[model samples]
Target chain A: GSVRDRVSPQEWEVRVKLAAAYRLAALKRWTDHIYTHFSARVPGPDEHFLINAFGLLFDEITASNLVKVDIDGTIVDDPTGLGINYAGYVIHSAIHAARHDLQAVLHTHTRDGIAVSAQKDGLLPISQHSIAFSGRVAYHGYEGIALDLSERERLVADLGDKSVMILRNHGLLTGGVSVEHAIQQLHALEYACNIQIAAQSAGNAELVFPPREVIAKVEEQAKAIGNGPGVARHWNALIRELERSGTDYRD
Target chain B: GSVRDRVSPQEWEVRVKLAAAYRLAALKRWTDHIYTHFSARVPGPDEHFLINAFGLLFDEITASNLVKVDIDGTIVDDPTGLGINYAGYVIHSAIHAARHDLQAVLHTHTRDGIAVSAQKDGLLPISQHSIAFSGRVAYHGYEGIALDLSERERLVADLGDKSVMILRNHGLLTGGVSVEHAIQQLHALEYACNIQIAAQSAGNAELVFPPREVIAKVEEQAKAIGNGPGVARHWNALIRELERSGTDYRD
Candidate 1:
């Protein structure tokens, strides 16, 4: 499924899965304009793609709307002229270039994600949901926007091999071996963030945050789950339910 | 529409609307088993007819399942072998016989409803949602199981012309000139009660309730947009939304 066999059946499945991830994110209100992008590696090549049709809403994105760009930040696909949010190409391309195991990169500035990111303590140990990221969680300081290609090196370094990371003063980012895995891990991270914000905003202390040592143990035990397609399946089902109610993420 | 004319067009509509109210109430989780009853007077007779069907969840109730009994508490229509909450008929009939203004009776003992009813300060002075229930709120002390039919007169005397009332240490009851008003009024009352409980539980001073004067001002100026059908219109949209969502609150 690499550059040599670009039209293979498996490659099309990856494209479709990636498109569904965008639509699913929009349905959950986890997108901002076209600011956030979820990209998949183009099958067999060392190449990758970015999402940008200039000004389309995340919900409006389709399989065809996706802009294919190379790791060197060159637009190889989408000849329709405009490809907005090209900043995504630099960031996503860097992650793909460095991590041979990476397949998908999902980023969001969702309200819950932003709220939790702003908290002084970061993700707390209070919730089992938060345990999914545990010791694997990484943090990257703010550096304005991702427009500067030079920042890609720092971004990739901060992300390392962790499945989840919080972008300081920004929001959340997660990577996976596939689109489904990416979406699932990101959803868990988002829900954990939401629950934490809601519980804390109530100003009640019924919920307890785990101590540092136990947090480390749980982190190790929970990492055994290794983030997979299970999360994506749950999110896909929610979108289908919304569709049955005359709701469509598409514009 | 006072209990007098037989075979009138409006009466049939009211009857169907009243039956729908019971089903909708159940859908919203405002039911109290067979312990509480919702009733409407049958126009054209000197003796008003009340709903008497007992032993079923309100949501499980249908138009055909509704029982009608006369003002004297005699069974006029009994479809379910179980009689109506006989005491419900007595209390409801007493209100109808005295007020001559109310057309429906709604009763419930939901957790929040009981909590607000037991509060020493009564209805709160905060929350825009609670304002609509201000001046219209009334109270009547709970006397065990509400089994004594003789207690109806006191209940009516205490309620006067108000559309909503709290059954102290028991639950909440709402009366109206039509079934729709009664249901809508109760929903508003319940919303206020729930918000109050949540605010207090937060234990944050900023979240504390507003003063009494504000609550009273909001309640006194609250206006009725319309009655019966208007209330039905609001509820009809809700039920249809639930139905479209495949909520499956039906038999």
Candidate 2:
């Protein structure tokens, strides 16, 4: 019997989307082995969520294989019997518990993400990509490996209401109302970091910054488009790309 | 008739290897659409070389579809009917004309490559990868788009006996006695740049540099290991990875 037969259709749909997110992150090289986690809240009032089964590479994740866990990081269901990484549980449980508005949370320790996080300035508005995140990003100072239960309060506090957060000297985190929205935010944040690193590395060259008014205008523009159907379109195109490459994430 | 029947076995072998290099580079995300070029000396006294057929993505290149040309950038054969990028011709032709010792020349406009090239300090000896290129890298000032035939002499003069050259404000270039050797050099140089950009972006974090003697020791160690049969071993592993991913570069 398939796990899909056991869960509500809503939960199963979220599982499939979360699994696709994992594969897409792997394709983008955003994965840090099996360390970082992308989680989606399971529908209904159980406060359970789905995460990658530990020891599985991001590309190996499948809808039926994702582990289900309650808000306390205790496993509600372990499809692979591999459980889950405690670090993923620690960070993800914090956001999932506090932010009922966000259905999905994505995190990455990609080189560019960590590089920009370590920068004191953090996500400069030098490029068009960077400005889309203007005044919208939050920050959380690193406090070791993030395994301590007490740190969750501070982590959630740092994240506040923002969709994106740069974990100082650590990495990046983003949350959205849907899995597609989270993927869109993560892509924008990651590309923003990539462009910043490249632009800043230009020795002594003056970086161009758009006027504050223009930055604000672009932010408003981004918000309008971000809530549209484009997010689903973008994610569908990515899924098609994965399918073209013969991915089995949907299983 | 297959191109295999027309060319010498040695030239055919070079074509297959060079095409594999292109696919391997694409896998590494080092390609800039159809803009950059990787060329190999056709194994003969004719001063002929093999390059990609313009307009094809790096992953689209195949052994039989590569265009063959003389050192002067004149097409001796065009398998795809799309000659080649002029910028590729200007830069690759200069190196092929001057450096008879190098059998292959590879160029890229990779983000990290261009980032590190634009840095005034050039390739900094920051990480283990960077140390391997300590005293070996050469620099050439960017002269617009390399269209003028006059700049070829100066470009060759700047490259001089060095296997690696950083084109200031442009990108990276490497040459080797064989395609495998060139791939190895390009990988090391590109990775070194990647690490440098990452480390440098850690704003205000004091970068730790190994002592000058330690740098020199590592450079010597790198040289020793680089000349071993490991280059072929590494390339074979890459080719296998491509095969696993269902690449058709060998077609």
Candidate 3:
């Protein structure tokens, strides 16, 4: 891992973590071909973040192959000679620019996520999974395929104070103070989307919903448990599976 | 693969192909935590079928580990010291007993499939994918998890003459002349459910549908294309992926 020797310890750690998330996404089927992206901000003076080399599938992503790009879309470091996804830059750069409190951003276009995103009611509080994101999840109306530089402001505006966002008529998005938090939130967001789609698909059936008071209690419980050792446990199990599967995401 | 030498050549072949389908289902995330079953009739003097050992995860299933059972729910062979899922035998036995033309029965409890199954309109011809099963797919309402001896008659009666059936409020079922065909049918049926859920989730947005004439043409076209080399191509690709992942279902 030449990149490991080239970067600082903290930077290498983030690279490995981001690489694992990519593999996990592929393993979890939370991707849209190679279209969606996950980026982690490199902690240094230039304020550059690492994005997947655009042409690579999540299965092929490795820590050493992740490309670093500045906030202005300049590739600061790209060992694989691969370019970054421009849409990734357009959506991710917006949040990184506005929220320094956030360190990682993940975007996905899975079937369930996209299905729930297209729903007019948005993320309904139908299941315990859906209720976790009931109050915290934000929504940004879809503009089109290409999200322009001007739309970046609105993207960030819609994501204001929230770690997760549903890009309506498009997909799901999440950011966090760290890559672990980002992946965890994205996992939950996807699950919420899955639950909503399942419940809503039975359009005529009387779908059950948690009472407002119950939803409020769940929201409170989620906040307390959200950052607990639960996330670390889940992340470790996934990483272990990747390791056992003989993937060299660290490479 | 010592079991290969023990079983008849024809039975061994069915075991490997059936195991591959199990592995493919796990890889495809179309499984329900060791609940669903894929069974193929073992070609021999007696009318017996091979099914997965009840306690194993799909990922851990192997050709050598599959158990042989008669349609009467009696085990004829068990190398892995595991029993058959009775619910599996109930659903599969119904179809197998009724249709000797069918050699394999595949059942699934996927989120999208279950969602669409519960819908009143059943499978609408909303997309090219859905159009494939528009006229071909059958529906069997949910009759609780525990199926009785009498219900098997109705189950087979409802599935009459159709390769694909949606067990409403439950999941999906497919019976094919071969293990390959059953898996292929289940894959297409699941895809149709997914497309339906995605289009219907929009609720207010007008979902475009192909004209009845167009759908009728597709039904004819699908029949022509359904059993083409395409399914073999798809099955081979899935098997290649499993081989690449190094989990030997042929053990």
Candidate 4:
């Protein structure tokens, strides 16, 4: 029987969306093999969450194959025998357990992300994209591979109330009330990092910065659009693009 | 009625490969909408060349639809009503007219490429990919879009005996005896640009540079693999990827 047949309709819907996020990350080349993770909290009182089964390429992820796990990293159900990565468990559980408002959490170790993380200045506000993230992004110091259970408290504390965090010398992370919101935040953060890197290539002195008032205005503008229907629209277009290439992500 | 019937087998083969390069660039997200171009000299006595028809997305290009033009930029044959971009014509014609040793010329305004170009240091020798280009990259100050035909002489002069050129504040250019060589050079240069931007995000002071001897050895090592059959092998794999995505480019 299909795993979809065994799950509640609401849980199955979240599974499909979570699977799409994995495929979208692969499409964007944001994946670091099977090392990074994107997880969506299961829509129930059970406190379960769904993540990609370990050992599968992001492109190979499917709705029915996601591994369901509890907050303590114990597997509730894994259709694929591949299991789960412990690092994913440690980072994701901290957010899901603490932030009930955020249904989805995404992470990436993309070159641009890692580069910005390594930067002493972090993401510079040269472009409009970066400006939107000004004072909104959090920073977490690297604690090796993020496998220790004790690191969870510090991770959550560093993330605080922010939706996005730059894991120093590591990568990026985002949490949102929905998968759409999380994906959108990730996209913006990644693009901002890319633009910051590019703008800084001209050297810090040569980079042009908008005025503080303009930056403040744009940040307010970004907040309005960020929570609007645009995120879902953008995600739908992405899904269409994926389908145009192949429907395997929906499998 | 097929375009293959109208062209010689040699020309048809080159056309297919050139078209594949366009599709491959699109797949790599190296395209700037309908702008930027990749050109190949026709395999004949005439100083004729093939380039993508202007106003067409790189992915929309096909073997038969490529615009054939002379060194003077006049259309020799254009299956699509669209003409070639004048900027492409000016830049490509400059190299093709002067560099008889090179049969293919590829140019891009990619984000990383443009960023590295704007850098006062140009391409840095911070990564293995960048090290391979040590002392080999040429730089030409941006002359405002290459529309002035007079800029051709200066462009060629600046690119003297070098396969790659970084157009300061503009983009990247590569000339090769074959499309595979040009593509390989562009890939390395682009990747090098990407790595440089990323590494520099940590601030210039934080970037680690390989020793002079190490840089020299890698440059020598790169030359052997660059001229070997590996370039063709890499290109063939890229073509396979394009075909797996869609066979439309082969049309």
TM-score of chain A of each: 0.84, 0.95, 0.95, 0.95
Each prediction's whole-model lDDT (CA): 0.67, 0.81, 0.80, 0.82
TM-score of each prediction: 0.52, 0.55, 0.55, 0.56
Q: Who is ahead in TM-score, 2 or 4?
A: 4
Question: How many steric clashes does model 3 contain?
Answer: 0
lDDT, model 4: 0.82
DockQ winner, 2 or 3: 3
- Residue-by-residue lDDT tens digits, candidate 3, B74-116: 8888887767776567878878888898999898877777666
Interface RMSD value for candidate 1, one decimal? 13.8
For model 4, how does the per-residue alpha-carbon lDDT over A160-213 read when each residue is reduced to its tens digit? 888899999999999988898899889878877875668675367755454576
lDDT of 2 by residue, A1-251 (tens): 38888899999889989999998898888965445789999999789999987666776789999999988778998888878875557788888778899899888877788767656677888888999888889987655443466667788888888889987656789999999999999998999988888787752136787899999999898877645789989888989987876757777
DockQ order of candidates, top first = 3, 4, 2, 1
Misplaced by over 4 Å in model 2 are A203-205, A225-227, B1-196, B199-251
After superposition, which runs of candidate 4 have C-alpha atoms over 4 Å from their true positions?
A: A147-150, B1-251
lDDT of 2 by residue, B1-251 (tens): 47888899898989899999999899889989878999999998789999998788988888999999988778898878899875667788878878888999999999999998887888876554566677788999888874476677778888888989999999999999899999988987886677567858533343445457667666666666535665765576567667867756776
Candidate 3 off by > 4 Å: A1-196, A201-251, B225-227
Question: By DockQ thresholds, what CAPRI class is model 4?
Answer: incorrect
After aligning candidate 1 to the native by TM-score, how far in Å is the CA of A118 from where it should be?
22
